[PDB]
């Protein structure tokens, strides 16, 4: 979609969806569009992964509106069937949100990805 | 061509048919009321194919 | 057995016999229209006025109810109780009321049938004696408020034990519980013997005949796992669809197509059964709208089976019958439909039958193949027959143009069948 | 009253009378049936 | 008398490469699997594969089914007649009956059955019928002894089925159709 | 149904507040309502009683 | 407002240790690991919940 903004490449998408698959093992990951909207308002979101091929795309465009206010990074992985399978859930997931836990073992690997997402912004 | 090699055309020649599973026709009751029999039969054939 | 088991068996046989006044004020108080207090305070003479006034309105809607005013709804038929009469005379009271609930069941949304059957409820006790043909005539109105009243009277038979939790319930009996009725192997054997009784009088109506199949589809659907259960099921269902094709009515015939196509996809039937079914679809196929549904059966029936003899030539009595009811131009307008159903495994049995039986019209046999992308083995199995035909038939130039279509596409397929049978140079030398 | 003495209408009833098992198991189809897999552990 | 062989390599992210070995190794085409993030195994089938190979050169037949494993149970079936056109093809059916990492995808030698197994959870072989993409429901039951299935194999000829475990016991079956 | 509406009404609202092109025929919304009617008539067919 | 910032960050950690306790009950196969520091966290098995 042309409404898609910052859309990660083929390369960084493999890094983002690997951290998603490791955050769903630590259960540190809230799932879905209507739950990633929650973690923004609580402020406990590290960053926001979203899908690009969701039809209609307008059902998740409020998250780039919301993240610009609260200064939380966001990208678009290209396909919602991908982010679904990497999240541990049978249904396709169109927006995924990494929560903040500083005791996490994967904290280092999140901030490596987070810096690359703020690089696109 | 061998006799078993003929049958691999007969195996590959079939196509996938959508099956009849136990939850496939239970929604048809909501549209029985005052419909013509022609337009119901296509609503069966649209499920099977 | 015990005493109280045998002594409650006498209670069923005297369920209608009014003995005490309190026994009468329980039996007479239940009815279709009036509530329990105002029903017990009125004569049969009062009810007969409202019935015979209403029944003359139903005679105006259709003249078939005019006969029952001579026999059941007559003024002399107030004094007759069921219990007083002999055993032969009761079966005639059943066979009148069984003939009545066929004609009554169609006009059941209308207000006058509610006032009409109620005298035949309250005087003739059909809510106790014969509640099968009362309920089987009115089994398709389960969502309506009139069937909720019919449940609020009837002591349910042992076969309708699925609805027994919905008697005097608030909400209507839901759509799945209607399927749990038809899932039983015995309750179907009523609904056969109700329907073959209902076709013989040629009063089968559209909303009724949908609700038959919309249950008969689901019974095949709920039993699509248990291959034993389906094996004992089609003496019940296919014997309907055999008799449901014998109907003059075009509307009954389309219902037979819905059950046949659904069962054929759920269970691979034998070759002889499908060719049997294809004759009876062909034989009584008269009206316009029954023909379109009938063609999508044979389109779908031939793809259900798969095995040796899958693509066999049609038998002689079958094929010319299919040419009689379906035209070779009309089958071409069928393939050009943008629906474009999977006509794949049938036409390669249709084309081979042309090659053996008729042979006069092989211009069509080219134009059949441009319109359908066939399967790989089918084209080989066609071209073997034509090369047999190439030697036998007195040689013809239009047959040469058929192979020119196969010199266009799949050249090696033409070679490999010739390298299986005959020579490579001899076919081009033959033409 | 009863004695036995275009295609017919009774063609579907007659062949149902003359068969007792309806599923095509006699074919040796060489196509595999869905949902029911004949297997024998060795 | 003449055929060419083709590599089908899999990126972990899900990009399928198509090298051909007859001429020196060049890409023929690329196509991404729809979805498929953490991908373990691909094996093609329906013809001659490395499990059900050929005898003479005329026996070599082009395959028809392609299956793509995952680390989340997802198998994706590709009809090889249609998927070679668009180069970003839609898979036919997304099989998701397993719950863990796929570790063995082998076909029948006739190309009608797709095994799929996981070496993580015990008793985790599932058979998939083709082309209907319906998992078989009767076998395997609960009481079908498998163990942690680590190695599945079909016969080329007789229709047998050999399933390994972690315990060491190779338990053998017979597809009674064949 | 109060979940399924408030989900699909949240799907319908973001197509209305945040689409600069509107087909203005309720084309997403009638696709939303048909999913709830499928959810509803599924959920009325199921019943807690024993048959 | 110095105290609210001291109140809230203390009050978030009550949720963070409660939310981790609430996520132990649901499904899945859990691994009891202990760090070398002594803090207890869990690691659920890589298994797509259905």
From Swiss-Prot, chain B:
Record's miscellaneous remark: Present with 6560 molecules/cell in log phase SD medium.
Gene this protein is translated from: NAN1
Organism: Saccharomyces cerevisiae (strain ATCC 204508 / S288c) (Baker's yeast)
Protein's name in the database: NET1-associated nuclear protein 1
Subunit comment: Interacts with snoRNA U3. Interacts with MPP10. Component of the ribosomal small subunit (SSU) processome composed of at least 40 protein subunits and snoRNA U3. In the absence of snoRNA3, forms a complex with other t-UTPs. This complex can associate with pre-18S ribosomal RNAs.
Purpose: Involved in nucleolar processing of pre-18S ribosomal RNA. Required for optimal pre-ribosomal RNA transcription by RNA polymerase I together with a subset of U3 proteins required for transcription (t-UTPs).
Subcellular location: Nucleus, Nucleolus
Curated annotation (Swiss-Prot), chain C:
Gene Ontology terms, MF aspect: snoRNA binding; U3 snoRNA binding
Residues making up the signal peptide according to the UniProt record: none
Major subcellular location class: nucleus
UniProt modified residues of type N-acetylserine: 1
Keyword set, alphabetical order: Acetylation, Mitochondrion, Nucleus, Ribonucleoprotein, Ribosome biogenesis, rRNA processing, Transcription
Subcellular location: Nucleus, Nucleolus; Mitochondrion
CC terms in the record's Gene Ontology section: 90S preribosome; mitochondrion; nucleolus; nucleoplasm; preribosome, small subunit precursor; rDNA heterochromatin; small-subunit processome; t-UTP complex
Additional comment: Present with 18200 molecules/cell in log phase SD medium.
Subunit structure comment from the entry: Interacts with snoRNA U3. Interacts with MPP10. Component of the ribosomal small subunit (SSU) processome composed of at least 40 protein subunits and snoRNA U3. In the absence of snoRNA3, forms a complex with other t-UTPs. This complex can associate with pre-18S ribosomal RNAs.
Family under the similarity heading: Belongs to the HEATR1/UTP10 family.
Protein name per Swiss-Prot or TrEMBL: U3 small nucleolar RNA-associated protein 10
Organism: Saccharomyces cerevisiae (strain ATCC 204508 / S288c) (Baker's yeast)
Residues of the full protein shown: 2 to 426 of 1769
Swiss-Prot record, chain E:
Residue ranges of WD repeats: 47-88, 97-138, 144-177
Signal peptide (residue range): none
Cellular localisation: Nucleus, Nucleolus
Domain of life assignment: Eukaryota
Functional summary from the UniProt entry: Involved in nucleolar processing of pre-18S ribosomal RNA and ribosome assembly.
Subunit structure: Interacts with snoRNA U3. Interacts with MPP10, UTP21 and UTP25. Component of the ribosomal small subunit (SSU) processome composed of at least 40 protein subunits and snoRNA U3.
Additional facts recorded: Present with 9570 molecules/cell in log phase SD medium.
Similarity comment text for this entry: Belongs to the WD repeat UTP18 family.
Protein name: U3 small nucleolar RNA-associated protein 18
UniProt gene name: UTP18
Covered range of the whole protein: 417 to 594 of 594
Swiss-Prot record, chain G:
Region (Disordered): 19-50
Subcellular location: Nucleus, Nucleolus
Family listed: Belongs to the UTP11 family.
Function statement: Involved in nucleolar processing of pre-18S ribosomal RNA.
Quaternary structure and partners: Component of the ribosomal small subunit (SSU) processome composed of at least 40 protein subunits and snoRNA U3. Interacts with snoRNA U3. Interacts with EBP2, FAF1, MPP10, RPS16A and RRP14.
Protein name (Swiss-Prot/TrEMBL): U3 small nucleolar RNA-associated protein 11
Full-length numbering of the shown residues: 201 to 250 of 250
């Amino acid at each position: 979609n042309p409404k898609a903004f910052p859309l990660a490449d083929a390369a960084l998408t493999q890094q983002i969806l690997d951290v998603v698959q490791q955050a769903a093992n630590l259960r540190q990951l809230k799932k879905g569009a209507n739950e990633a909207t929650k973690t923004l308002n609580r402020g406990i979101s590290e960053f926001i992964i979203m899908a690009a091929d969701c039809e209609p795309i307008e059902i998740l465009l409020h998250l780039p509106l919301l993240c610009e206010d609260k200064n939380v990074p966001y990208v678009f992985v290209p396909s919602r069937v991908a982010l679904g399978r990497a999240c541990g859930v049978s249904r396709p997931v169109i927006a995924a949100s990494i929560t903040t836990n500083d005791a996490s073992a994967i904290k280092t690997q999140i901030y490596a990805v987070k810096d690359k997402i703020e690089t696109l912004l | 061509e061998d006799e078993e090699d003929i049958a691999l055309e007969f195996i590959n020649g079939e196509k996938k048919d959508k099956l009849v599973n136990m939850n496939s026709f239970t929604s048809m009751f909501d549209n029985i009321q005052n419909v013509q029999m022609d337009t119901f039969f296509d609503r069966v054939m649209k499920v099977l194919t | 057995s015990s005493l109280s088991d045998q002594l409650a068996q006498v209670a069923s046989n005297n369920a209608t016999v009014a003995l005490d006044r309190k026994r009468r004020q329980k039996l007479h108080s239940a009815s279709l229209i009036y509530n329990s207090k105002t029903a017990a305070t009125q004569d049969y003479d009062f009810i007969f006025e409202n019935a015979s006034k209403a029944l003359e309105e139903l005679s105006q809607i259709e003249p078939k109810f005019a006969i029952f005013s001579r026999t059941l709804f007559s003024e002399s038929s107030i004094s007759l109780d069921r219990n007083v009469q002999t055993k032969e005379e009761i079966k005639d009271l059943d066979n009148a009321i069984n003939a009545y609930l066929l004609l009554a069941s169609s006009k059941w949304y209308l207000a006058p049938t509610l006032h009409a059957t109620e005298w035949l409820v309250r005087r003739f006790q059909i809510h106790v004696k014969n509640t099968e043909m009362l309920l089987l005539s009115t089994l398709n109105y389960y969502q309506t408020p009139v069937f909720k009243r019919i449940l609020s009277i009837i002591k349910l038979p042992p076969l309708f034990n699925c609805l027994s939790n919905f008697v005097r319930s608030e909400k209507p009996p839901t759509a799945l519980t209607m399927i749990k009725l038809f899932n039983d192997m015995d309750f179907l054997k009523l609904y056969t013997s109700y329907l073959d009784q209902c076709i013989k009088h040629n009063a089968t109506y559209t909303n009724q005949l949908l609700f038959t199949t919309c249950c008969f589809i689901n019974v095949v659907a709920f039993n699509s796992n248990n291959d034993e259960k389906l094996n004992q099921l089609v003496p019940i269902l296919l014997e309907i669809s055999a008799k449901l094709l014998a109907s003059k009515s075009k509307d009954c015939q389309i219902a037979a197509h819905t059950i046949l196509v659904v069962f054929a996809t759920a269970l691979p039937l034998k070759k002889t059964i499908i060719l049997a079914a294809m004759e009876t679809i062909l034989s009584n196929l008269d009206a316009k709208e029954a023909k379109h549904s009938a063609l999508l059966t044979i389109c779908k029936l031939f793809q259900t089976l798969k095995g040796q003899g899958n693509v066999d030539q049609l038998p002689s009595k079958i094929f010319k019958l299919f040419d009689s009811k379906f035209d070779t131009v009309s089958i071409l307008t069928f393939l050009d439909k943008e629906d474009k159903p999977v006509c794949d495994k049938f036409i390669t049995s249709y084309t081979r039958s042309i090659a053996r039986y008729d042979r006069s019209k092989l211009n069509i046999i080219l134009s059949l193949l441009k319109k359908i992308r066939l399967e790989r083995y089918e084209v080989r199995l066609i071209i073997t027959d034509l090369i047999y035909l190439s030697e036998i038939l007195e040689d013809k130039s239009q047959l040469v143009e058929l192979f020119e279509y196969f010199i266009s596409i799949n050249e090696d397929l033409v070679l490999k069948c010739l390298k299986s049978l005959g020579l490579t140079g001899x076919x081009x030398x033959x033409x | 009253d009863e004695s036995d003495s275009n295609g017919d209408i009774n063609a579907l009833t007659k062949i149902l009378s003359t068969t007792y098992n309806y599923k095509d198991t006699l074919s040796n189809s060489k196509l595999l049936p869905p949902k029911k897999l004949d297997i024998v552990r060795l | 008398g003449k055929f060419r062989t083709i590599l089908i390599a899999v990126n972990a992210y899900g990009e399928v490469w198509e090298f051909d070995l007859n001429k020196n190794g060049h890409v023929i085409r690329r196509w991404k699997d729809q979805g498929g993030v953490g991908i373990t195994k691909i094996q093609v089938g329906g013809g001659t594969t490395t499990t059900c190979p050929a005898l003479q050169i005329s026996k070599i037949k082009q395959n028809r089914w392609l299956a793509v494993g995952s680390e989340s149970g997802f198998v994706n079936l590709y009809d090889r007649n249609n998927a070679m056109t668009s180069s970003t093809p839609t898979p036919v059916a997304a099989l998701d009956q397993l719950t863990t990492t796929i570790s063995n995808l082998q076909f029948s030698p006739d190309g009608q059955i797709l095994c799929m197994a996981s070496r993580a959870v015990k008793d985790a072989l599932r058979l998939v019928h083709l082309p209907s993409c319906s998992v078989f429901s009767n076998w395997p039951t609960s009481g079908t002894p498998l163990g942690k299935v680590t190695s599945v194999a079909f016969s080329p000829s007789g229709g047998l089925l050999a399933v390994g475990n972690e315990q060491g016991k190779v338990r053998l079956w017979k597809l009674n159709h064949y | 149904i109060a979940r399924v509406l408030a989900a699909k009404a949240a799907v319908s609202l973001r197509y209305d507040a945040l689409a600069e092109d509107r087909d203005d025929s309720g084309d997403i919304g009638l696709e939303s309502r048909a999913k709830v009617e499928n959810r509803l008539s599924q959920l009325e067919g199921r019943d807690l009683r024993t048959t | 407002v110095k105290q609210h910032l001291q109140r809230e960050t203390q009050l978030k950690q009550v949720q963070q240790r409660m939310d981790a306790q609430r996520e132990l009950l649901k499904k899945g196969s859990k691994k009891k690991i202990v760090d070398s520091s002594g803090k207890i966290s869990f690691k659920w098995k890589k298994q797509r919940k259905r």
